[PDB]
């Protein structure tokens, strides 16, 4: 038995940060060796008990995620930061115990004309608590006149779209992110390593 | 970098039909609000148009209703102002401008070099 | 129907030092549950298009030095430039966007 790592790392759909999928890898063995023997991950920041030597570690729950973020903002995923994506769309806990694996996908998720099919929220008037999915296509108003079901004066749609083009350098380029978060619960350990 | 450019305008007979084009890129028109603003030589500055992302809001001004319209193509990433039944009080330096998003307000931050229109 | 008035029509302030602009609106611009004012201040040199100075009536727009500062109550607004440099003379504009029909008050030509 092998964990479905390939599905989470070699899929093609993924989703924007405003409504991000979550996968519960459990009751399987994950070959972590291939994670750090590929020379293809731009960032491999593990904050867990052991960024290397994940052998002899067994847990009762593995949480996998998948995000698409603009290049320069990838570093905002880590805990203790503050910014648009980090505070309004995804926030790690102070005692996070997993890994953040971010790679470049500029050769798959960008079109010459422009792929305006990626979104991120811009405001919530409430700082997000520990990571919690937030899907809401609201028409939040800004006073003045009522927003009668249309994005009119002082009416601001809360889902900005990324400016993805295959011309910008590292800064404004797509990155695919995986917040591979561990969670040791009271239940018996299931996901034992190699 | 991100800059706004304009095309069209010039000379026309009284009551003609004009199509002024404002084009730009680098900041994803899909998620910004654009406007047209008048600049009449040696009179002042005014506001005569409004649009939104999906063309939901078409707010006009006082001397606009029934004679101006605003449209925009996001595929080609530009907007067009169609201008019918002109009068000499319409002649001016027309400016295309952008919104601000949640930050700033509905204000104007990036302004194109503008165009000129006059009946004669 | 927001008829706007401004006092310094083509202001000329001692050829230097500071400069003061006063801008008032008939209907109050603030909002009940905002405590913020929806009026903005614009710069415009002759020729080139107008540029941002103040948004939300109290904040210095990023991209300009800290000389300029616009303040005022919920209905009255004033400028403070302090030092009148040799590359700042240009017309100043008010924008009133509390209502669906924003209107631009008028031009004040700050020069010499
Ligand atoms: C995913 O695709 C890469 C592409 O080279 C391949 O090396 C890898 O074996 C595939 N499977 C996983 C689980 O990464």
Numbering used by the authors:
A (entry chain A): 334 to 527
B (entry chain H): 1 to 120
C (entry chain L): 1 to 112
Mind quoting what the paper says about this structure?
To gain structural insights into antibodies and the SARS-CoV-2 spike, we performed cryo-electron microscopy (cryo-EM) analysis of complexes with the proline-substituted stable spike. Accordingly, we performed local refinement to improve the density for each Fab-RBD portion, which allows fine modeling of the variable domain of Fab bound to RBD.
First, class I type18 Fabs (Ab188, Ab445) were observed, which access from the same side as the ACE2-binding surface on RBD. Although efficacy varies from strain to strain, the Omicron (BA.1) variant has become resistant to almost all antibodies except for Ab188.
